[model samples]
Target: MMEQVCDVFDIYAICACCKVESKNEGKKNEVFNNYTFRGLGNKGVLPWKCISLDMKYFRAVTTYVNESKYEKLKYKRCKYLNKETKKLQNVVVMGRTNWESIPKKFKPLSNRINVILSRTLKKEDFDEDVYIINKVEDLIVLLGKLNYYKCFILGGSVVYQEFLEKKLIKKIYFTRINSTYECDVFFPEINENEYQIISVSDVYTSNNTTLDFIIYKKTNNDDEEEDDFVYFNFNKEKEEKNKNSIHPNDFQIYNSLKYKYHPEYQYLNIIYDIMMNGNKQSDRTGVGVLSKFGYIMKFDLSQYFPLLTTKKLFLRGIIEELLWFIRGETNGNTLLNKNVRIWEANGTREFLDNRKLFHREVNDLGPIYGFQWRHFGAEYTNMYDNYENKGVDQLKNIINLIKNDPTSRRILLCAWNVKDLDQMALPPCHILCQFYVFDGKLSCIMYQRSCDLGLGVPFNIASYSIFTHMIAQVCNLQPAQFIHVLGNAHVYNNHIDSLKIQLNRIPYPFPTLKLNPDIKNIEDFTISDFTIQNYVHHEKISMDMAA
Candidate 1:
């Protein structure tokens, strides 16, 4: 072990040394929060603890604070839920000067214990349970009677320096504000070498600007271990960050807690951007569109399932549609039997007449996705084309290529057959998908000619994500990402209200996709073999499907 020296504090600088030697020993790509104190005390072990330090929204202003940000809040930036009681049970410690800075009604934040360090101010000044420390020397003894594991230090640079100049703080959660403000007080400068960033959270909103929450812990290992906390821990994998770099679980964890616009609000912004700024172009539906060509939306399949939580999606029907495609059946009769009606609008005689296409019966879709997937070009007139034993099995062949030769760029699954577009129920909007494998993980991107943003985009996301996971399972590779690239991504004029209902709301964490591991082939998957765990979404919005 080696020590990292600091010149910021000479009073306790000698004591502010790291316990470990190397700077990159336990450094990992992904960091997790550990909450193992409850489990430790259950085994009769001493509950090791730490102190959390921060400033409210990273501002030390005397007044003009954003009080509305804390209205009905459960956890503060400097505090979090108590894993022991599974509730909010934190202790806030501030100095006397900071204590008098609060507006009277909001003083001594509700729902937790409040502590003040004061040289003056008697016990009769505040609430009966309020804590007052007479001197810095007696802080430990007074804290011994306190009832929380997590303690937050707020405001007053003197209190911040006292803890740092002394050797007491263990963990820190700083609310890094993006704006600069004039202030008389400031936090003391400390050696950054003493700590390693545990995790950087998604952006949060306050007063219409952006703020970020960051977690930091000492590089020393004596306080933290392999089983230090419960919720999350530092992953051992060394993943470097880039503008395009993302952890698979980043969406599920960060996006849910605090809703940020760029990545988390990616889908919503794409629609809003097009609606307010896209060109007014005519569509085949005659409903028209605000058209924007060459658009791209990257959904990190690693972080969350591609389900748009803003609008309700029938996940079961999504799997059923893919299954219908996999079976090589060119008829909507199978979906109707299963009570899935997503394809019914285009399968009717009246609907096809508008496109100048003819079908023998109600649901014989004549070589759309189902026919193209199982049998590429083999001669076919209707659903009874003896397709049971005919056609090149593109789906099975691609899955095998992924397992045998993963780097082959030639491995593609195409559903848009030039010769069959006229005989089909509707010209395929989603044209083709290409699967890529790298470092024992699989990723895929789909190219679509036209996309109905409010309705079709969400449907196509689940369909393709399911397809990627299914192929990943059979090929023995984990899923990494699903990218949706569109030629003409447009929002229908009628979808305005439905879009408005869903846009302002925050999104929940993406659900899990579980497939039966025993199945080794793509054809072996059944409706019962697939399971969507923890699937939840907003209320369903009914939209008119324009033919």
Candidate 2:
């Protein structure tokens, strides 16, 4: 099996890992839809409701190709010997059950060559557009003879399992549904060590049905190339090439790809905007600011923790602050005791006095985020007073909605209280966030009324992402996406030089965050229950806060 993959890599430039090697490798290989088989169908019919978007995607991936553009990568292009139709076309292979299960109107899926494997089925029984094969081997032999751009294994349980067993399938374009259905057939269990998820799309919702399009590729250890370094070196060489006045990597516009897909680069792109083109503005801190209104960023929480890798960030502070928020601790003293003082600057007696909150004690962030999140609409006295049954438990209610009524549109929490704003030391920057649950995964969308982009955005991203993960764990769901929406995103002038330094460096892949499986309750999660794995990044960039 390994040898076959290796040989394919050597012969076919558009192999399984071609996406890693080139950005234009969207097609040119076998695509398996139900390779993981987690209840794709029941009794030869789709297990769940038909999603029109998924159907559109299925047609595009199987039949489309840009032969003129990708021909440079193909060595010894296979030719079609048939005199009638010499042009290359894509192929769709299926088992007899699956072929018969297709709707009569769409029986021969259009614009592609169709192959069905069946010992009992004969060519004479079908139209000339359909080809019949006896076995998987026969299909492979036929594939070698025909000129095809890409192949799709449209499956029933037996067909998918057979192809997977034979190691013919290269990539899977899996449509992950949010809810489970009653199904008798199941997809074969995939070995984790043999396959790796290369890309995951943001959760797509239509007509209250949610799904994600996830791509998985077969793994080959010897072909293990780090794309991060490839990008880094490409930038490095391009830097030298600029100095020497020459062009490099003519095949790709690396800068465009970086700006489009790199997570860290997304942060940098926003920074670059604020630095070069933002409107100069003034704020409460009396500091000069370069600000932009209305910006949005998204991260796939299931892929990697979206911590910025361009500069080293303090994960401990993020975890502790989130825990503090979850615990509904309005006082900074608790985080201070744990050697985390993110809220201390705002909790100072002077700052409290500035807000005319004279009655509040030092380190008392009166009725701030924690209070609003855990107990909204509650009258505030001080941080030490217990108001268990006084206010609405918004966090608990949101969690309940996630578990019991996931599709509810009201799974949201808000911390901006008009009545309590004057009492609080500082208003919540991340004022409100809504939780979304689909296909057994949890996602969050936060609205920050005012954002300090350079210093606060990174921490805010990590905080919400981890928070989503924690909620997902308790609800028995996976964390899918965390979208940060900002109304007024700004960069403190003092941080400009430092941010530029961070932006120039190439970003490494994000670290993996693991939570202890034993912890089910959201409040039960402590700092010790989390683990950060494979965190590689550039050295820390120092930036001062305007406060």
Candidate 3:
């Protein structure tokens, strides 16, 4: 495994050794010499380099015991390595110790890897390579600064123990000899559960003594197969509960205004108005529509699910459309063939008849969500390489972040690719999105570059909100909010009167969103996973798509 990993990427080897004085006066000098031998041998053979911690404790103890002996061994090690390599391979020494503690022979190597661990240490004590005083946290920060592909914890026993306790050590290498030398201090016993021996190599040194070099690696036993039923029960209960309720203040306003109508109806009306004139535009550039829609959506979604209230919209159809986009598809012929008219106005029929439209080849169209949900696009070759539509897979990833690491900065997804847009019979409506986790709840913000308010907006609202609910259920998080940012939102000229009639009606109290009680995985969720609670609203409104 080590060799395989090395072949793929660079790996660094590190070991931590303590500079301690023992009851046996001569042993300290011999230990340093042994360290040099093993260190140089390891460095010469390993595909990676080595680094050590230069702790003040080790230096101070060595100076107090046998300063001369320490100096001579340190100097010899320093002299053996070239200047540049020494800088790269030197150990990071921590803490404050008198300069006299440094072996006089190794004094020249001091400029290479002396690291002082303290907050009060002066900058003058360090060279460019010498890291200055700091706390343990600072050391971690320095490790990040180094930005090595991977770091090995080379030890002084304390440093090794620190990283080990923190679960940072990935692997360990130890060389054990048959004869035990007398020493005042000893290394800690290896925890078998935490580490496993990978390889053991026996070698004979110049003195004809045999040694065993053993390599060990930290085991990842925390990865366990999860029970699907456990997730199912948890998700089911969460979905049944109401995720949102009207604030008392808002309820007071609703009662005072005699807005005794259903909140669902009101939500629908507001959505209808916005989809009409509120979000309407005439320009081919979708920006104007998006800005206006975003403004209206912010106001309307504050109280409702932002699902379309105009006309009879298909919730499942919109979800399928979204799923299709995630599958990274660029054609609509399959969806049209299924009689899903979501792409009716997008010239999908023409493209198909002209034989210019692409279709999913068997191998390239495996359970890919976009092809299954919207349209499948397959490469002509590799008949078996087709992907099945898996929009749920995409949805689950979003939920996982919200539940496990909400504060992470990378909670974003993109469905729009310029290269694929031209190949798409109908361009994507919702382009990019980000999820925010706050107050132990999840929220979603979607940016749609184009919207046909009369038709598309309603399904858009319902589908995305449902998507949010499903994600919240699977992730074991509450649904906080859903924000829609639109690029080109417009009501067609043909739907004006219907829009006005709906606008004249008053709005009702807001409804609560509920999810399915049984589904745990976002991908496996279906329409049964969600329902609107206390949904009260006015009659449906009509709107026109601007020409």
Candidate 4:
């Protein structure tokens, strides 16, 4: 056992001392908040008692150090390591109060170097195995001299806050107890944007208290790499931060909490995943794109409307276009009259002529989404020509089955028609949607073959959610969920910059959707009948559309 003491140094000279010792900083991480580590204790005691796994979790993470970055030589950086002995150990720095709060049996915290930062405490105040720094400046001097794998700041709130405020912490091993507890010494509210979740553990129950462990590493803006190449090669191993970074394990724990219940986070998270892990590929639009295949997102319609709040969505355009689809209008001018230019680009005469549709009139979208919905398998004709009794009405049929045979698994609406593909100006991106009814609640799952993550996705989410709500109202059921499955989710290269802005901003609470209760028929519901209340959202982030 060895003991070392450092004399008090000038607090104002911390930067000068840190500059000398910063080279030996190693990886200074933090483990505190909420139950065991960060949201730690109540009046010098833990809020909850005897959570054994949490103790094990704390020890396991703090003790284990990944020294792969170091050379094969036995001696790495640490004050305890000797040239002859080759002794290497992890370090845990804590406030004097934290050291005093520990039980007698774990005073030295076994197999690790115990460091205490105290201005008033003296060397004789603790066991001989511990190291004491007289001031914050002395801690920097010790840091410069010591060569350890990872230094964890285990705290008494003030120490954690000091390190956090100094930007000294690199990673946070956070354990979230599912329930709230009484606590006087609380962890500071973490700025989530400052860190990215690296790994998370499944929920573990200990004595009726449920909790999960999460590891978050601070975002290093300086280390941003240029030209990160990603591709699809059918590999089974997870794609570091690409495939499933938001691990369902992480979401399941915070799913119920309102502050944590942002569906748009999943949306923003997917865009982030695409940017980080998606394959850089060329597209038919002649623009490059970052593409990822097969993604799913779910929103509970029963909770609130899923309209994106991160960016100001053109809710009017979304409503008008959806209403156009319900009216089974194939003419883009029909939507254009309502000042919705969403389908304008596709219906342009020049675009139609390029698709070898020279004879088609301007603003006439061929047998597209609406045509397929209200009259599938209909005879080909101009947009103005309507055949009321022509084809199978998939939407009407779907509503009928939902109302009468709520148990029918075959309640489906399809827009992808191979026979009519050539006639349309643009083929359907959102091809099929299925409806399910259970417990007098209605749910819809829509599958889109091609998805534009930045612009199209937000519109799609709100459209389908509203569609499900309308169907539910007519069927005498409450809206439950809107499940969206995408085949080829991609972000156009031009939009990536604008979307990065959207990715950084936080999301607000979802707005409420109030549809007139008097409307019994789906067709009777107009734009005036639908109202969005408490719609709080961020400023608009404009991105150009690639037609």
How close is every model to the real structure, measured as TM-score?
A: 0.57, 0.57, 0.41, 0.56
Off by over 4 Å in 4: 1-261, 544-547
CA displacement after TM-score superposition, residue 164 of candidate 4 (Å) = 16
Greater-lDDT candidate between 1 and 2: 2
Candidate 3 scores a C-alpha RMSD against the true structure in Å of 28.0
* lDDT (Cα, tens digit) per residue for candidate 4, span 1-547: 1222111110110100000112333422312122222345677877776677677877776677556743332233333333332656677888888788878887788767777888787877664767898765667566556556556777767886777676666667666554445666666666666655555444344544444455655553433333232234345565454443234433332332223334667787788778778887899988888899999999877756778867776578888888888888898887888788898899887899999999999988889988999999988799889579889999889988998899999999999999999998999999899998899999899999999998789999999998899999988999998999999999888897677566655454456678999999978878888887545566667796343
Model 1 spans > 4 angstroms off: 1-262, 544-547
lDDT of 2 by residue, 417-515 (tens): 999998888777888999998899899999999888878898888888888889899999999989999899898878876775665554544566789
Shift of residue 170 alpha carbon in model 2, Å = 27
Local accuracy by lDDT, each model: 0.62, 0.71, 0.45, 0.71
lDDT of 1 by residue, 1-547 (tens): 3222221111111111101112354532312121100011111211122112123432221112233433333232213323221333455677776677567887667655567888888888775668888776565554444444345666356677787665566555544433223233444555466654455454433442233454545545464654576326455535422213223443343323332533446777677567555777787678877778877777666545666655566677878888888888877888988999988988888877766765457777778987888888878777866776577778878888998999899889898999988888877988999999999988998999988888888888889998989989888888888888989888787876566556555453445567899988888888999876534345567875343
Backbone clashes in model 4, listed as residue pairs? 32-37, 32-38, 33-37, 33-38, 33-39, 34-38, 34-39, 77-147, 77-148, 78-147
- Candidate 3 per-residue lDDT, tens place, 1-547, comes to 3223221212222432222223466531331122321221121132112221123322332223233454454443334332221122323443343232446666633323444554576777545445563655555445433412223333444555455665555656554332222233234556767765454332222122222344556665533336655665674532311123112232222232222233234344443444432523456533334114443354233334544332333355565555544444534554565566665555434443443455633213222334323223332232233445423344445556777788987777655545445444445667766887777677778788876665566666677676666666677776666777766556555554455455433332233455667877645655455555423334444354343
What would you estimate as the lDDT of candidate 3? 0.45
Cα RMSD to native, each candidate? 18.9, 13.4, 28.0, 13.3
Worst 10 residues of 4 by lDDT: 10-19
The collision pairs in model 2 are 37-187, 178-439
| Model 4 lDDT, residue 348, Cα | 84
